[PDB]
């Protein structure tokens, strides 16, 4: 599956970084699971995960730094409370969970740059 | 979340092993995802996954050895084509996916014992 997202995004002084994550849905999917994987220092870190039902708003799995809202066949993710050390490649994994068949999409990733104020 | 399932189940000569997996649903959940995790030799193996929907019959994710039918707030799982080497602890992970909030349940696990005929 094809998954497109911004190549680079700058985090604000507060430490908030928003980025879109659109996917070319082949079938008429109802359930979609968007998962944010942070890749840095040759290790993967599952930042957050959310389930998007087509006719309803995006819901994130319990407590995470991620917020956002869905719109058709794309999601506007918003990562909060970022610092300098969090700077890495934020890969956007999409999965069409229901109905069958199962489709997997992994984007190139959004390199979110962060710096600490004073 | 509380998830109950048989402690031990014996697989038939053909290699079929059925077991129930009931869960104490706190809220009025419509979508529920039952996942069979086989734990053996200090490693987890995702055997299969089924999405219970309100208005539909239990639907397994693409092709698996698992079949079964839902009945209210429980599922009767049926694992087929098992052999001696498959013998392990079949843990039954339940997730209330929709509507919010998200609930996770993981049972103690059903130790399925299997024997090869001659």
């Amino acid at each position: 599956m094809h998954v497109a997202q911004p190549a680079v995004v700058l985090a604000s002084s507060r430490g908030i970084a928003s980025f879109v994550c659109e996917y070319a849905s082949p079938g008429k999917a109802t359930e979609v699971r968007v998962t944010v994987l942070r890749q840095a220092d040759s290790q993967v870190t599952e930042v957050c995960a959310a389930t998007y039902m087509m006719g309803n708003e995006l819901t994130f799995l319990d407590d995470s730094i991620c917020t956002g809202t869905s719109s058709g066949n794309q999601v506007n993710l918003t990562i909060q409370g970022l610092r300098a050390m969090d700077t890495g490649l934020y890969i956007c994994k999409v999965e069409l969970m229901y109905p069958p068949p199962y489709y997997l999409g992994i984007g190139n990733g959004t390199q979110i740059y962060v710096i600490d104020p004073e | 979340m509380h998830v109950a399932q048989p402690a031990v189940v014996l697989a038939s000569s053909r290699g079929i092993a059925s077991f129930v997996c009931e869960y104490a649903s706190p809220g009025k959940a419509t979508e529920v995802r039952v996942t069979v995790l086989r734990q053996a030799d200090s490693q987890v193996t995702e055997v299969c996954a089924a999405t219970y929907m309100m208005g539909n019959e239990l639907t397994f994710l693409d092709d698996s050895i698992c079949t079964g039918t839902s009945s209210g707030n429980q599922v009767n799982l049926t694992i087929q084509g098992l052999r001696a080497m498959d013998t392990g602890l079949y843990i039954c992970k339940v997730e209330l996916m929709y509507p919010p909030p998200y609930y996770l349940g993981i049972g103690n696990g059903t130790q399925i014992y299997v024997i090869d005929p001659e």
Epitope: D63, G81 | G105
Partner: nanobody
Framework: QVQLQESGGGSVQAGGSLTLSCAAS????????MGWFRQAPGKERERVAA????????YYADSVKGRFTISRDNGKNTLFLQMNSLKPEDTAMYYC???????????????????WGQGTQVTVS
């Protein structure tokens, strides 16, 4: 494998203060959610607090909201629970937990934590 060991627990007077430590060891990925759970005599383990594996993100129970604080040292080796304004209801067996290595986001149910510490008792008069 990851191994957690608690310390700094004990009995104190009501309206007092304590600081629980949980020295975490043997991490492949140190960007993992850690949390604190307490178990009263008979009742099940409820989550008091939990911190995100990535960035600053603390999450608390309403029962201890404002009075308790969860924090991590620079190296992410030791997890702390700053306990202030201790009430008799806070009396329980406190456990420090960790999510599966790599899982930054924090489960509310204790079923979503793989690694646990032996536990430490906290009594409040």
């Amino acid at each position: 494998q990851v191994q957690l060991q608690e310390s700094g627990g004990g009995s104190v007077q009501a309206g007092g203060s304590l600081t629980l430590s949980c020295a975490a060891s043997g991490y492949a990925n140190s960007n993992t959610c850690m949390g604190w759970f307490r178990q009263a005599p008979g009742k099940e383990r409820e989550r008091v607090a939990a911190i995100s594996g990535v960035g600053t993100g603390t999450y608390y129970a309403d029962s201890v909201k404002g009075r308790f604080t969860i924090s991590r040292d620079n190296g992410k080796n030791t997890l702390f629970l700053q306990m202030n304004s201790l009430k008799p209801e806070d009396t329980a067996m406190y456990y420090c937990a960790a999510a599966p290595e790599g899982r930054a986001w924090c489960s509310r149910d204790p079923s979503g934590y793989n690694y646990w510490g032996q536990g430490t008792q906290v009594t409040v008069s």
